[PDB]
Design an enzyme around this catalytic site. Structure first.
Site, PDB file in Angstrom:
ATOM      1  N   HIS A  95       0.841  -1.181   0.000  1.00  0.00           N
ATOM      2  CA  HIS A  95       0.000   0.000   0.000  1.00  0.00           C
ATOM      3  C   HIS A  95       0.906   1.272   0.000  1.00  0.00           C
ATOM      4  O   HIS A  95       0.417   2.350  -0.380  1.00  0.00           O
ATOM      5  CB  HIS A  95      -1.101  -0.076   1.117  1.00  0.00           C
ATOM      6  CG  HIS A  95      -0.611   0.068   2.528  1.00  0.00           C
ATOM      7  ND1 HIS A  95      -0.236  -1.032   3.295  1.00  0.00           N
ATOM      8  CD2 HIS A  95      -0.479   1.133   3.341  1.00  0.00           C
ATOM      9  CE1 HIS A  95       0.138  -0.658   4.502  1.00  0.00           C
ATOM     10  NE2 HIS A  95       0.072   0.659   4.527  1.00  0.00           N
TER      11      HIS A  95
ATOM     12  N   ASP B 217      -0.314  -7.754   1.625  1.00  0.00           N
ATOM     13  CA  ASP B 217       0.170  -6.389   1.535  1.00  0.00           C
ATOM     14  C   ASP B 217       1.791  -6.338   1.607  1.00  0.00           C
ATOM     15  O   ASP B 217       2.336  -5.643   2.474  1.00  0.00           O
ATOM     16  CB  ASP B 217      -0.372  -5.554   2.634  1.00  0.00           C
ATOM     17  CG  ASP B 217      -0.058  -4.115   2.545  1.00  0.00           C
ATOM     18  OD1 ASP B 217       0.199  -3.631   1.419  1.00  0.00           O
ATOM     19  OD2 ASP B 217       0.015  -3.416   3.620  1.00  0.00           O
TER      20      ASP B 217
ATOM     21  N   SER C  23       4.095   1.937   8.051  1.00  0.00           N
ATOM     22  CA  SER C  23       3.753   0.811   7.115  1.00  0.00           C
ATOM     23  C   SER C  23       5.065   0.349   6.438  1.00  0.00           C
ATOM     24  O   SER C  23       5.873   1.210   6.076  1.00  0.00           O
ATOM     25  CB  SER C  23       2.774   1.257   5.987  1.00  0.00           C
ATOM     26  OG  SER C  23       1.473   1.376   6.484  1.00  0.00           O
TER      27      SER C  23
END
EC number: 3.4.21.46
Length: 230
Positions: free
Chosen positions: A41, A90, A184
């Site tokens: 992402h 992800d 992230s």
């Protein structure tokens, strides 16, 4: 990272900053001299007018350091199951356009290959350059936090994430001290190896009933091997 502290400089020499147009967007982990693992992402909204780089050797994102080096990327390999609207698969691999120079401040860390759940209560380490306050303060230097692992059965109860945590994901406690926007892609290190990769960048931060979620690298060992094979 909310509620953590400034890390020892260069003590996690596997830590990469994934950058778009010269600004940190996500963490990552150096796998060898050519590949970096992050979260897919991280690329969401990246257009062909943008430039993606990996910064290795960094403590400060702005100050001069002897082994800080910025690398262009020659291959961008999102996991095929990754999507903007999905928590699943992800992961992303980046191949650096030139071989990374390894040294005191730049060194890979192994990935966990064994498919083994980490016991609840185990303290694992996560570091990143994500926000350090709710108002969105970006730190200049790498921060770190020790996080307590939560088992999947707990994290999926209706009072926590209510069934969305798959077998390829793992959780950690999030009361007050937590990963947040910009963390992230940073690795979660358990023991001697990378166990997970921060996902769910949009998740609220610091709410104990919305645990940290991480993608389990052992779950993706076949894909990682196949992509990174020498």
């Amino acid at each position: 990272i909310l509620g953590g502290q400034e890390a020892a400089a260069h003590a996690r020499p596997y830590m990469a900053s994934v950058q778009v147009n010269g600004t940190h967007v996500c963490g990552g982990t150096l796998l060898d001299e050519q590949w970096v693992l992050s979260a897919a992402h991280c690329m969401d909204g990246v257009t062909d007018d943008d430039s993606v780089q990996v910064l290795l050797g960094a403590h400060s994102l702005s100050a001069p350091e002897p082994y800080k080096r910025w690398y262009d990327v020659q291959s961008v390999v999102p996991h095929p199951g990754s999507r903007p609207d999905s928590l699943e698969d992800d992961l992303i691999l980046f191949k650096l356009s030139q071989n990374a120079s390894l040294g005191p401040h730049v060194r890979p860390l192994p990935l966990q290959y064994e498919d083994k759940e980490v016991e609840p209560g185990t303290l694992c380490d996560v570091a990143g350059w994500g926000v350090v306050t709710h108002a969105g303060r970006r730190p200049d230097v790498l921060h770190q936090l020790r996080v307590s692992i939560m088992n999947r059965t707990t994290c999926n109860l209706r009072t926590y994430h209510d069934g969305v945590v798959t077998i390829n994901m793992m959780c950690a406690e999030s009361n007050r001290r937590d990963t947040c926007r910009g963390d992230s892609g940073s690795p979660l290190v358990c023991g001697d190896a990378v166990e997970g990769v921060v996902t769910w960048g949009s998740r609220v931060c610091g709410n104990g009933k919305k645990p940290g979620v991480y993608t389990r690298v052992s779950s993706y060992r076949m894909w990682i091997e196949n992509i990174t094979n020498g």
